[PDB]
Structures are given as structure tokens and as C-alpha cells.
Paper text:
Galectins are a family of proteins with some specificity for β-galactoside binding at their carbohydrate-recognition domain ([name]). Tandem-repeat-type galectins, like [name], contain two distinct CRDs that are covalently connected via a peptide linker. In the present study, we used different conditions to crystallize the [name] N-terminal [name] with its linker, and five structures could be solved. The N-terminal [name] prefers sulfated and sialylated glycans, whereas the C-terminal [name] prefers blood group A/B. In particular, the N-terminal [name] strongly binds to sulfated and sialylated glycans.
The best structure, structure 1, allowed 152 residues (Asn7 to Gln158) to be identified with 1.08 Å resolution. This is the best resolution for the [name] N [name] available to date. Electron density of the first four residues in the linker region (Ser154 to Gln158) was clear, indicating that this part of linker forms stable secondary structure under conditions of our crystallization. In structure 1, four residues (Asn7, Gln9, Asp156, and Gln158) were seen to interact with each other via ionic interactions and hydrogen bonds. Surprisingly, crystal structure 1 made using the first condition has space group P212121, and not C2, and the carbohydrate binding site binds glycerol and not lactose. This structure was solved with the crystal being soaked in 20% (v/v) glycerol for approximately 1 min prior to data collection. In structure 1, glycerol was found to replace lactose in the carbohydrate binding site. In our crystal structure, the C and O atoms of glycerol occupy the same positions as C4, C5, C6 and O1, O4, O6 atoms of galactose in the lactose-bound structure. Interestingly, glycerol was found to substitute lactose at the carbohydrate binding site in 1.08 Å structure, however, because the hemagglutination assay showed that glycerol did not inhibit [name] N-mediated agglutination, this ligand could not be physiologically relevant.
Numbering used by the authors: 14 to 165
Write the structure that this text describes.
Amino acid sequence: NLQNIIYNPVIPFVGTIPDQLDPGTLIVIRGHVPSDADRFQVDLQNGSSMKPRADVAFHFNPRFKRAGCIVCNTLINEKWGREEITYDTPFKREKSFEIVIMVLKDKFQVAVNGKHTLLYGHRIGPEKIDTLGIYGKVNIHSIGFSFSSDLQ
Ligand code: NA
């Protein structure tokens, strides 16, 4: 089962991820998109500073204008790289969602609402990730984690 759970956080949320992001690690984020949303993002970061801004290994950015999309990217030394855009977005204003990010050796895999959504190859070594940030127009119900070290 998921552990290290956070309930109903204030957004923006910035929290230390409780263990290393080894292959098989799961980050599970349940929430809903508010009626007025333009975009939100989930960022897996190397550090927590907002200024100068911490590197973002994996930026997962649902956008809601027109037909919507999900933009993924990486921020290194305050510069964004090439966007990878997934156009068939499952997210909808006023609807709840579950995001499951799984770390693999060479990429992240993301499923939304129980269906595979996208892959994103590592551009920063995942061992450098220590922080989860959630920003923008989104209402988070819970955040939970699964690590290979979890006891039960
Ligand atoms: Na940003």
C-alpha cells in the first residue's frame, strides 16, 4: 500500500520525496481540476529553491486551453529543454484524476486514470531528484509513495 501520504495540501506544494527515486518507485497523486483551470504542473526537482530556481528533472504540465495537452520538459540551470507534448489528454476541468508516476531505469512512465499516458526519458539522473513540487490550478486530494524499502 502507499505510504508517506499527504492529505489536502496547500498549493503550491513543495515537499521532500521520502526516499531515493530508484526504479519501481511510484508517486501517486489524486486530485481534481477546478472549473477555472488553465494549467497545472507536477515537477520532480533537484532542490526546493524558487529563486534561483531548482532544476526540474521531470516537468509534467497538463494545459487546458482549446483541446488541451500535456507538456513534458526538463529545466536545467533555469533553461527549459525541448518540449515533449502528448496531445490526447485525459484531464478535464471539474473532473477528478489519479496520476501514477513510475520511475524506470531509463525513463519515467505515467498512467492517468488507470491507463498508460506517456513515457519521458531521463535527462537528469533520477538519483538527483529530492523534491516534489505541485503548482498551478489544481486541487490535490492526496499524495502517496511506494518505495522498495517500505515496511508493512
Ligand atoms: Na514553470
